[PDB]
């Protein structure tokens, strides 16, 4: 009943230590929220986009650590808004494994510093809302130490953002989220 996608920031601003955290967070979530009726998908982004595993591919090999271990950082710019648009349109595409009727959950992991992207959030959020894609934002790096980046997470996250935005090293975020998913 749940299709869960991850949009992970692979741009250059993302320090290697932090990209690893992103992969460790994603792997743990998959292992924790592993429900017989829950599929996972992941796309990495910078200026270019990469679907590491579709819902179908996960359904064919539900081994989190196996799917996440080969993932290498793309580097480059940060086209977050475009990435969100591609996720809803490409990941939650039934030709990719997405199931009609299932709840749509997107976990966006970034440092909150969109750059180079020709699209603004205001261009991709309405469509996400329209597709009923619930958004969780996990902030890595200095995402919370800047006024700009802090608001970027709030802008991406569903309402209320305070209930949808977590720090990557708040190891208690997965249980809060999981607790929340019982209230879809
Ligand atoms: Ca970046």
Q: Could you describe the 3D structure shown?
A:
It comes from Homo sapiens. Belongs to the integrin alpha chain family. It is found in: Cell membrane; Membrane raft. Glycans are attached at residue 93. By secondary structure, the chain is of the alpha/beta class. It has a single domain, classed as Rossmann fold, CATH 3.40.50.410. 35% of the residues lie in helices and 21% in strands. The chain has a 6-stranded mixed β-sheet, sandwiched between helices. β4 (103-110), α5 (125-130) and β5 (133-139) form a beta-alpha-beta unit. The protein is globular. The protein starts with a strand and ends with a helix. The relative contact order is 0.19. Calcium ion binds at residues 9, 11, 13-14, 78, 111, 113, 115.
- β-strand amount: 15-25%
The H/E string reads: EHEEHHHEHEHEH
End-to-end gap: 10 Å
User: Which superfamily, in CATH terms, is the homologous superfamily?
Assistant: von Willebrand factor, type A domain
Number of helices: 7
How many beta strands in the DSSP annotation? 6
């Amino acid at each position: 009943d749940s299709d869960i996608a991850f949009l992970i920031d692979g741009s250059g601003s993302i320090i290697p230590h932090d990209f690893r955290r992103m992969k460790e967070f994603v792997s743990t979530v998959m292992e924790q929220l592993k429900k017989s009726k829950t599929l996972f998908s992941l796309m990495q982004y910078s200026e270019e986009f990469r679907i590491h595993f579709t819902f179908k591919e996960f359904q064919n090999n539900p081994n989190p650590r196996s799917l996440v271990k080969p993932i290498t950082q793309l580097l480059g710019r940060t086209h977050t808004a475009t990435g969100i648009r591609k996720v809803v349109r490409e990941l939650f595409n039934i030709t990719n494994g997405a199931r009609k009727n299932a709840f749509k959950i997107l976990v966006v992991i970034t440092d909150g510093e969109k750059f180079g992207d020709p699209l603004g959030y205001e261009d991709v959020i309405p469509e996400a809302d329209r597709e009923g894609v619930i958004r969780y934002v996990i902030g890595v790096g200095d995402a919370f130490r800047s006024e700009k980046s802090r608001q970027e997470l709030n802008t991406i996250a569903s309402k209320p953002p305070r209930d949808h935005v977590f720090q990557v090293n708040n190891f208690e975020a997965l249980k809060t989220i999981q607790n929340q998913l019982r209230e879809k």
